[PDB]
């Protein structure tokens, strides 16, 4: 289809070694979390247990693509 | 030699093989014997 | 050799398959049935 097309081509030429904006400006990252459970807070080892669902977002100039279709939603494959 | 002729012989049989496919793969099932040597049985818990 | 015919198939239904797209990525809903068979619940 067209989405393999898409995901075929913002992998060419791409570096996984560098962020964006490499050597222009730092990424801004912005962050949520979603605590399922905040779990038995035991004070022999002074720790406490969290399940949560961490999300970041930010921007990447180079995952840029132009179509009729607005998000690409994926798996952990890519 | 004696090496590279074994060598040669494991990359032939090695090459297009299909690790998808179990022996006779559209055919009769193939039979697997099993033994087992038994070292130790360490701990039986309740 | 009845084992090249099976690889060509393999081969075939993975020539140009994208395992990062659910199938009817563009025209329906997938719809996955589930099963459970549960051989132990455990302690």
Do not use: C
Not at chain 1, 55 to 65: C, E, G, I, V
Not at chain 3, 13 to 33: A, I
């Amino acid at each position: 289809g067209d989405v393999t097309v898409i995901l075929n081509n913002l992998l060419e030429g791409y570096d996984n070694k560098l962020r964006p904006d490499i050597g222009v400006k730092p990424t801004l990252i912005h962050t949520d979390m979603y605590v399922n459970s905040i779990g038995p807070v035991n004070a022999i080892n002074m720790e406490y247990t969290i399940d949560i669902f961490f999300a970041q977002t930010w921007y990447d100039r180079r995952l840029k693509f132009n179509s009729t279709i607005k998000v690409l939603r994926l798996n952990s494959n890519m | 030699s004696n090496m590279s002729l074994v060598k040669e012989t494991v990359d032939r049989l090695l090459k297009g093989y299909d690790i998808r496919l179990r022996p006779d793969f559209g055919g009769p099932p193939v039979a697997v014997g099993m033994n087992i040597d038994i070292a130790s049985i360490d701990m039986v818990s309740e | 050799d009845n084992t090249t015919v099976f690889t060509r198939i393999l081969d075939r239904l993975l020539d140009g398959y994208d395992n990062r797209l659910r199938p009817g990525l563009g025209e329906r809903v997938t719809e996955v049935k589930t099963d459970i068979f549960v051989t132990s619940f455990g302690p």
